[PDB]
Design a protein around this nucleic acid. Sequence first.
DNA 1: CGGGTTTTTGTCTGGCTTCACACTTGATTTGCATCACTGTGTAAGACAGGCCAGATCCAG
Length: 77
Amino acid sequence: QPLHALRNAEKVLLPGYHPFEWQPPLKNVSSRTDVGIIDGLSGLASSVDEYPVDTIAKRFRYDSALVSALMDMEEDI
DNA sequence: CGGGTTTTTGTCTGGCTTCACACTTGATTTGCATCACTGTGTAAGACAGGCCAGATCCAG
Protein backbone atom coordinates (compact mmCIF):
# COMPACT_ATOMS: atom_id res chain seq x y z
CA GLN A 1 0.00 0.00 0.00
CA PRO A 2 1.20 3.58 -0.64
CA LEU A 3 2.34 5.86 2.18
CA HIS A 4 -0.97 7.68 2.66
CA ALA A 5 -2.80 4.39 3.26
CA LEU A 6 -0.28 3.44 5.96
CA ARG A 7 -0.48 6.88 7.55
CA ASN A 8 -4.26 6.61 7.55
CA ALA A 9 -4.21 3.15 9.14
CA GLU A 10 -1.82 4.43 11.83
CA LYS A 11 -4.59 6.54 13.38
CA VAL A 12 -6.44 3.45 14.63
CA LEU A 13 -3.57 2.37 16.92
CA LEU A 14 -2.58 5.74 18.38
CA PRO A 15 -4.24 6.84 21.64
CA GLY A 16 -7.25 9.11 21.43
CA TYR A 17 -9.33 7.09 18.98
CA HIS A 18 -11.53 4.88 21.17
CA PRO A 19 -14.29 6.13 23.48
CA PHE A 20 -14.36 5.41 27.21
CA GLU A 21 -15.47 6.95 30.49
CA TRP A 22 -14.47 6.57 34.13
CA GLN A 23 -17.47 5.78 36.34
CA PRO A 24 -16.14 8.06 39.09
CA PRO A 25 -15.12 11.18 37.13
CA LEU A 26 -11.41 11.87 37.36
CA LYS A 27 -10.57 14.84 39.57
CA ASN A 28 -8.62 17.63 37.84
CA VAL A 29 -8.57 15.57 34.61
CA SER A 30 -10.55 16.44 31.51
CA SER A 31 -13.28 14.14 30.18
CA ARG A 32 -12.50 14.71 26.49
CA THR A 33 -11.36 11.46 24.87
CA ASP A 34 -9.65 12.42 21.61
CA VAL A 35 -6.38 14.05 22.72
CA GLY A 36 -3.20 12.85 21.05
CA ILE A 37 0.32 14.07 21.80
CA ILE A 38 -0.09 16.62 24.58
CA ASP A 39 2.70 19.16 24.99
CA GLY A 40 5.19 18.22 27.68
CA LEU A 41 5.49 21.66 29.27
CA SER A 42 1.75 21.59 30.12
CA GLY A 43 1.24 25.29 29.50
CA LEU A 44 4.31 26.35 31.46
CA ALA A 45 5.13 30.06 31.40
CA SER A 46 7.87 30.76 28.85
CA SER A 47 8.11 34.56 29.08
CA VAL A 48 11.15 36.56 30.19
CA ASP A 49 9.98 37.32 33.75
CA GLU A 50 9.49 33.80 35.13
CA TYR A 51 12.09 31.09 35.69
CA PRO A 52 13.90 30.38 32.42
CA VAL A 53 12.82 27.33 30.44
CA ASP A 54 15.40 25.50 28.32
CA THR A 55 13.72 22.13 27.75
CA ILE A 56 11.24 20.55 25.34
CA ALA A 57 8.96 17.57 25.85
CA LYS A 58 6.10 15.64 24.26
CA ARG A 59 3.81 13.07 25.80
CA PHE A 60 0.45 11.35 25.64
CA ARG A 61 -2.35 11.57 28.17
CA TYR A 62 -2.16 8.85 30.83
CA ASP A 63 -5.72 7.46 30.71
CA SER A 64 -5.87 7.51 26.90
CA ALA A 65 -2.55 5.66 26.82
CA LEU A 66 -3.89 2.99 29.17
CA VAL A 67 -7.05 2.65 27.06
CA SER A 68 -4.99 2.25 23.89
CA ALA A 69 -2.74 -0.32 25.57
CA LEU A 70 -5.75 -2.33 26.76
CA MET A 71 -7.38 -2.18 23.33
CA ASP A 72 -4.15 -3.35 21.68
CA MET A 73 -4.41 -6.56 23.76
CA GLU A 74 -8.03 -7.51 23.07
CA GLU A 75 -7.38 -10.82 21.32
CA ASP A 76 -4.84 -11.80 23.99
CA ILE A 77 -7.32 -11.30 26.84
C1' DC B 1 28.33 -17.78 -59.58
C1' DG B 2 22.76 -19.94 -58.84
C1' DG B 3 19.04 -25.33 -59.22
C1' DG B 4 16.08 -28.73 -55.37
C1' DT B 5 13.75 -29.22 -50.83
C1' DT B 6 11.55 -28.40 -47.02
C1' DT B 7 10.72 -23.97 -43.33
C1' DT B 8 8.36 -19.38 -42.33
C1' DT B 9 4.38 -16.48 -43.32
C1' DG B 10 1.34 -12.77 -44.74
C1' DT B 11 -2.62 -13.25 -47.06
C1' DC B 12 -6.86 -15.15 -49.86
C1' DT B 13 -11.48 -16.38 -47.74
C1' DG B 14 -15.94 -14.41 -45.23
C1' DG B 15 -18.15 -15.42 -40.55
C1' DC B 16 -17.99 -16.31 -34.73
C1' DT B 17 -15.90 -14.07 -30.15
C1' DT B 18 -14.25 -10.34 -26.29
C1' DC B 19 -12.83 -6.28 -25.71
C1' DA B 20 -13.00 -1.04 -27.44
C1' DC B 21 -15.18 3.37 -27.44
C1' DA B 22 -18.48 8.46 -26.83
C1' DC B 23 -19.91 11.36 -22.47
C1' DT B 24 -20.68 13.20 -17.09
C1' DT B 25 -19.12 15.06 -12.02
C1' DG B 26 -18.07 14.19 -7.61
C1' DA B 27 -15.30 12.01 -5.29
C1' DT B 28 -11.23 9.03 -4.37
C1' DT B 29 -6.67 7.76 -4.95
C1' DT B 30 -1.67 8.51 -6.37
C1' DG B 31 2.28 11.31 -7.48
C1' DC B 32 5.23 14.80 -6.60
C1' DA B 33 7.18 19.35 -4.91
C1' DT B 34 8.70 21.73 -0.48
C1' DC B 35 11.19 22.76 4.16
C1' DA B 36 14.45 22.78 8.20
C1' DC B 37 17.81 20.10 9.46
C1' DT B 38 21.24 15.50 9.66
C1' DG B 39 26.28 12.68 9.25
C1' DT B 40 31.06 11.62 7.82
C1' DG B 41 34.89 15.01 8.45
C1' DT B 42 37.91 14.08 15.65
C1' DA B 43 45.90 13.28 18.33
C1' DA B 44 50.42 14.57 17.88
C1' DG B 45 54.48 17.13 16.13
C1' DA B 46 57.45 21.45 15.15
C1' DC B 47 59.33 25.65 17.07
C1' DA B 48 60.45 29.77 19.86
C1' DG B 49 61.25 31.58 24.42
C1' DG B 50 62.22 32.20 29.45
C1' DC B 51 64.91 30.04 32.93
C1' DC B 52 68.46 28.43 36.00
C1' DA B 53 72.83 25.32 36.18
C1' DG B 54 76.80 24.72 35.53
C1' DA B 55 80.68 25.42 32.85
C1' DT B 56 83.82 29.58 31.23
C1' DC B 57 86.54 33.09 32.31
C1' DC B 58 88.58 37.45 35.49
C1' DA B 59 91.51 39.31 38.83
C1' DG B 60 93.54 39.76 43.94
